[PDB]
Enzyme design. Structure first.
Site, PDB file in Angstrom:
ATOM      1  CG  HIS A 162      -0.287   0.465   2.487  1.00 42.57           C
ATOM      2  ND1 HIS A 162      -0.147   1.778   2.858  1.00 42.57           N
ATOM      3  CD2 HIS A 162       0.271  -0.270   3.468  1.00 42.57           C
ATOM      4  CE1 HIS A 162       0.464   1.839   4.029  1.00 42.57           C
ATOM      5  NE2 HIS A 162       0.744   0.607   4.412  1.00 42.57           N
ATOM      6  CB  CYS A 163       1.583   4.169  -1.411  1.00 40.55           C
ATOM      7  SG  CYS A 163       0.685   4.061  -2.996  1.00 40.55           S
ATOM      8  CD  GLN A 164       0.175   9.377   1.269  1.00 40.03           C
ATOM      9  OE1 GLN A 164       1.065   9.889   0.590  1.00 40.03           O
ATOM     10  NE2 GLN A 164      -0.432  10.018   2.269  1.00 40.03           N
TER      11      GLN A 164
END
Lengths: 149, 149, 149, 149
Positions: free
Chosen positions: D89-91
């Site tokens: 994940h990131c944003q």
């Protein structure tokens, strides 16, 4: 019976009695009618005052309504772009016709299925599309979300 | 007046008032209760006659009932295997409890959603609409049809 | 029944009902169909809308499917290189057609047999190639690993 | 959906919100997390449930993600070999995490860039454009096509 329902300024959801109310339709600047039944007349066809489209569907559990979505949206958009209103109706304004309106709102005002349902139901509390149609609205949502229409 | 509703020989559906009918419960051989609310009492609790399970839902926009399906099915089965009836109730409209009954009929008697819904509503004609639960059942149906575990 | 399964954006695994759903196929941009049965019709052949290939195999313990792998892959790749999708089906989408898809993934996405199986099974949980086919998939893996195809 | 996204049976892609869904993580059998930001928390760290790896990127002009590919692939593989899922994940927009997923599909399932991109976007339709990462994936594709180590 329930009154004709303005959904947008150019889009009205109603029942077969609404489709006969010539004076109301002309007051509302309606120039287009969608009849979502196989068997009802196109009321006032012979006065040549409206543009009509029949979506000849039943309210059953096997009826495919999705197949008519694109055609209906194009007709609503024809009414919209020339500054006229469109009345869409079936028998009660409960199931077939409501499903088409919900789907229009999903595609053209980008509402989720839940939000478009509540939007219509807030304005016309008697709506209740059958579960077959509700399943089609959910698949339509998927296809919109993925860009698949 | 009304009373709780037979669905299967061992499964009954009812509302808030129906849950308070101790005489009907004993005559129908109900040994088990699922109360699908966070706030209602466990009726007849102090009498020590029944086995209870609370599923602490609300009839809200985002209430997840799917999360309780497996737990409710196990408890229905434990009553079924014991030769006792189970009543599942919530409040007027039986929207939460009917959702769980329909789910159980879909998983354990393999009815389609529409058929399970029609089976229940035929027995219990007032089922308040809840679009959120309807969507959880349509997704649960897709999962069962696809063989998801 | 289980819904049609997208395996890759251009490759769908399905059953005989899926192969009749003309509207879905055109929505998905499918231009190619593989029918892995000796006896089913090529549905919609006469509308001249799809390119077809029959792999006329039975689901038995003696059926050789390996003999059809190279042909099927070339067809999937024809669909892929011209920007169209391909639907592959047998009767249920369980055994013959799933074996071909698993093998395609082994050769063209370099998945081990185990990983390609789990990839398809994760997307379509009803798949279950018979043990004959499973034995062929293992010898196909061997031949891929050694460079022997 | 309103949660993280299956890519392979053992590889999931998500944003900031999706990473906080502890129930979804456990149900999908995710044992491993790659957090591709310098500033976000390692969600659920104090619960000691997961193995983490931070790739301390920013979603910037000159951020080099290629430098992390080999490290991310080893960690995905360690999860894969262990029978556990890995979430990356990131944003919002999943630009950094999608870049790494696409890279892994190109190297390990040998999809072309466009096909890996379409595979991911088909499952996750919102991928924020980042010209810098796109250029890194195009150079990585060239390296893989030329057999560079």
């Amino acid at each position: 019976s329930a009154e004709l329902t303005p959904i947008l300024p150019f889009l009205f959801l109603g029942n077969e009695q609404d489709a006969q109310d010539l004076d109301t339709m002309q007051r509302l600047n309606i120039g287009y009618v969608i009849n979502v039944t196989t068997h009802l007349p196109l009321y006032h066809y012979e006065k040549g005052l409206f543009n009509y489209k029949r979506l000849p569907a039943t309210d059953s559990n096997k009826q495919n309504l999705r197949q008519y979505f694109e055609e209906a949206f194009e007709f609503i958009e024809e009414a919209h772009q020339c500054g006229k209103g469109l009345l869409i109706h079936c028998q009660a304004g409960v199931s077939r016709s409501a499903t088409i309106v919900i789907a229009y709102l999903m595609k053209h005002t980008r509402m989720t299925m839940t939000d478009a349902y509540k939007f219509v139901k807030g304005k016309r509390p008697i709506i209740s599309p059958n579960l077959n149609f509700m399943g089609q609205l959910l698949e339509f949502e998927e296809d919109l979300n993925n860009g698949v229409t």
